[PDB]
Amino acid sequence: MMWKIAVVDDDKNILKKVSEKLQQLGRVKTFLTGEDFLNDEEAFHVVVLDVMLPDYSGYEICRMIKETRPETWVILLTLLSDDESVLKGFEAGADDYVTKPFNPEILLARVKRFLER
Amino acid sequence: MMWKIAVVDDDKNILKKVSEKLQQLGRVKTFLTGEDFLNDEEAFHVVVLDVMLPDYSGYEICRMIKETRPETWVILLTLLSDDESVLKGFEAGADDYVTKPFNPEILLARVKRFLER
Ligand code: BEF
Numbered sequence: 001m002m003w004k005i006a007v008v009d010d011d012k013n014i015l016k017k018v019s020e021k022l023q024q025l026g027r028v029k030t031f032l033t034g035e036d037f038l039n040d041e042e043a044f045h046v047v048v049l050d051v052m053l054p055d056y057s058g059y060e061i062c063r064m065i066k067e068t069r070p071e072t073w074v075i076l077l078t079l080l081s082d083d084e085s086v087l088k089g090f091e092a093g094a095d096d097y098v099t100k101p102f103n104p105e106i107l108l109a110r111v112k113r114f115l116e117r
Numbered sequence: 118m119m120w121k122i123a124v125v126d127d128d129k130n131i132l133k134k135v136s137e138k139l140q141q142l143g144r145v146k147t148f149l150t151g152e153d154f155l156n157d158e159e160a161f162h163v164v165v166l167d168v169m170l171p172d173y174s175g176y177e178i179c180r181m182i183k184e185t186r187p188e189t190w191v192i193l194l195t196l197l198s199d200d201e202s203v204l205k206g207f208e209a210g211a212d213d214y215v216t217k218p219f220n221p222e223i224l225l226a227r228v229k230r231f232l233e234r
């Protein structure tokens with residue numbers, strides 16, 4: 001079962017690191033902006049989402065994803081590490097909040113545990 | 118319906134503080150040891166589990182939980198915060214890994230987002 005995974009982040013380096021790591025779990029699509037992702041009206045099982053994006057914030061895209069597909073697992077991945085930012089992420093409907101720099105092995109495990117559901 | 122949350126930790130203060138923060142979500146039952154938790158034949162939607170216990174390791178308990186009631190959401194709550202301990206947690210079947218000291222408001226959000234599933 002090769003699931004559909006999406007990675008949204010304006011940082012080229014994050015898209016490469018995350019995609020090449022989650023690739024073993026299935027098909028991975030990478031987007032540089034919220035618009036690139038939104039214009040790709042494909043349904044994904046998991047979405048690794050940056051918070052500080054050039055157009056739409058990660059909180060808004062997360063809410064939009066939940067509005068459309070509540071079953072979607074949304075993992076916010078961001079440099080924002082303060083408690084206030086973590087609370088805002090979950091408030092937006094995020095299923096997880098991971099800070100950068102991150103451990104790719106840990107991100108893999110987090111995604112895997114959701115797919116098993 | 119009634120959501121049920123178990124809290125297993127040898128630290129009395131963790132049981133009191135967590136239980137008081139989570140009571141708003143549903144019924145919360147506390148346990149000072151793994152043995153006491155394991156001998157309770159009831160089901161829980163979420164189990165907040167300590168790793169360093171007097172009798173068992175939270176990893177061991179987490180494994181048996183998944184081998185008996187895999188539908189249960191298990192959140193490890195421990196002072197162990199290094200990557201290896203985090204990975205061992207997920208390898209043991211954990212659904213989340215929170216480190217002490219923690220923000221009770223964030224743990225609440227983490228518990229709630231599982232209960233909404
Ligand atoms: F720029 Be993202 F919020 F890491």
Ligand code: BEF
Pocket residue numbers: 167168169170194195196197217
């Ligand atoms: F003793 Be627990 F692992 F914080």
Ligand SMILES: [Mg+2]
Pocket residue numbers: 009010011050051052053
């Ligand atoms: Mg960014």
Ligand SMILES: [Mg+2]
Pocket residue numbers: 126127128167168169170
């Ligand atoms: Mg302990």
